[PDB]
């Protein structure tokens, strides 16, 4: 295929970062990858096992290459020469966004972030970048089907990027409802038409962003954490909706409710939601203090 390739001798593994059921991730040095950077760090996902998995690897590499954008996960290329098959990603300091949110919550500094909880303007900065990525995917008419903070990485300078990780099914297994045997539905992020009728569209993606907007202002709490999976399915289908968090100002909770309209056709577009959040994010301290 028309993906970029990387020679094994340029890659040098340092240590393991994480281990899913279908993939290990390592930190590694990569030589001669970029022009200005002779020696840079990278994340290296190694494929596990099977003849069926070799095809899924192929599909990922193609999708990732053609769907590159400032706020989508950065992908350099593969290493086909000799097993195991490697995928080279850009290394992201702070890990996934859920972990980052939990570590800087109201439960009581650093290089990238001030001490204590994240500020209103900092929270809105994260919401805007995640929103910016969904405008790009909506534009090309690709549906994510599993948008959450656990599938968002954070880097140096608090740069946030959207992805889709198989490690999330192991680390955050509680966030999925198992069905059939090998299927896993993230019911707490899904709209009514997805749960009942099993239809996923761009409108079903906006609902999930509303739930992602709720995650951020709760500093990474699970939606409907008090309810079990079956209790949560009853709750969403019967039209009951999440509360406004303590950190969330009224103006921002209006944007969540905007995403949560029952009939899909009456929900707001992702472009208009981004417009509000980016405008709100870049607003001056005088405006945001009275917000
Ligand atoms: C563009 C979008 C969102 C539609 C998409 C993206 C992916 N694939 C990924 O996200 C994969 O990423 C990593 O494996 C990864 C692991 C570890 C790291 N890192 C840790 N520390 N630093 N980096 C960084 C990436 N898709 C996919 C498509 C088909 C099948 C499966 C997945 N679909």
Curated annotation (Swiss-Prot):
Motif (DXXLL): 38-42
Variant or mutagenesis effect after changing residue 248 to S: In CIPA; uncertain significance; following transfection in neuroblastoma cells and NGF treatment, no effect on neurite outgrowth, nor neurite length; no effect on N-glycosylation, subcellular location, basal and NGF-induced autophosphorylation, nor on NGF-stimulated calcium flux
UniProt entry keywords in alphabetical sequence: ATP-binding, Cell membrane, Chromosomal rearrangement, Developmental protein, Differentiation, Disease variant, Disulfide bond, Endosome, Glycoprotein, Immunoglobulin domain, Kinase, Leucine-rich repeat, Membrane, Neurogenesis, Nucleotide-binding, Phosphoprotein, Proto-oncogene, Receptor, Repeat, Signal, Transferase, Transmembrane, Transmembrane helix, Tyrosine-protein kinase, Ubl conjugation
Effect of residue 23 to R: In CIPA; processed as wild-type but shows significantly diminished autophosphorylation in both neuronal and non-neuronal cells
UniProt induction comment: Isoform TrkA-III is up-regulated upon hypoxia in cells normally expressing it.
Residues carrying the site annotation Interaction with PLCG1: 287
Variant or mutagenesis effect after changing residue 170 to Y: In CIPA; might impair the function of the enzyme without compromising autophosphorylation
Family classification: Belongs to the protein kinase superfamily. Tyr protein kinase family. Insulin receptor subfamily.
Domain-level remarks: The transmembrane domain mediates interaction with KIDINS220.
Role: Receptor tyrosine kinase involved in the development and the maturation of the central and peripheral nervous systems through regulation of proliferation, differentiation and survival of sympathetic and nervous neurons. High affinity receptor for NGF which is its primary ligand. Can also bind and be activated by NTF3/neurotrophin-3. However, NTF3 only supports axonal extension through NTRK1 but has no effect on neuron survival. Upon dimeric NGF ligand-binding, undergoes homodimerization, autophosphorylation and activation.
Protein name, as recorded: High affinity nerve growth factor receptor
Species lineage: Eukaryota, Metazoa, Chordata, Craniata, Vertebrata
Entire-sequence positions represented here: 500 to 795 of 796
């Amino acid at each position: 295929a028309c993906v970029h390739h990387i020679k094994r001798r340029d890659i040098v593994l340092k240590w393991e970062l994480g281990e899913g059921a279908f993939g290990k991730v390592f930190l590694a040095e990569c030589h001669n990858l970029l022009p200005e950077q002779d020696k840079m760090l990278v994340a290296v996902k190694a494929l596990k096992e099977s003849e069926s998995a070799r095809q899924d690897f192929q599909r990922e590499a193609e999708l990732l290459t053609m769907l590159q954008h400032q706020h989508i996960v950065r992908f350099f290329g593969v290493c086909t020469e000799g097993r195991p098959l490697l995928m080279v990603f850009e290394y992201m300091r702070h890990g996934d966004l859920n972990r980052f949110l939990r570590s800087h919550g109201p439960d009581a500094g650093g290089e990238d972030v001030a001490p204590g909880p994240l500020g209103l303007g900092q929270l809105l900065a994260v919401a805007s970048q995640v929103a910016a990525g969904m405008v790009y995917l909506a534009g090309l008419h690709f549906v994510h089907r599993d948008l959450a903070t656990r599938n968002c990485l954070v880097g140096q300078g608090l740069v946030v990027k959207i992805g889709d990780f198989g490690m999330s099914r192991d680390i955050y297994s509680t966030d999925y409802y198992r069905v059939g045997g090998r299927t896993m539905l993230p019911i707490r992020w899904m709209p009514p038409e997805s749960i009942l009728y099993r239809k996923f569209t761009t409108e079903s993606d906006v609902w999930s962003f509303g739930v992602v907007l709720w995650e951020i202002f709760t500093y990474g709490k699970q939606p409907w954490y008090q309810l079990s999976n079956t209790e949560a399915i009853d709750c969403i289908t019967q039209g009951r909706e999440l509360e406004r968090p303590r950190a969330c100002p009224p103006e921002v909770y209006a944007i969540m409710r905007g995403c949560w309209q029952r009939e899909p056709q009456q929900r707001h577009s992702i472009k208009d939601v981004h417009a509000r959040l980016q405008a709100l994010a870049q607003a001056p301290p005088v405006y945001l203090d009275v917000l």
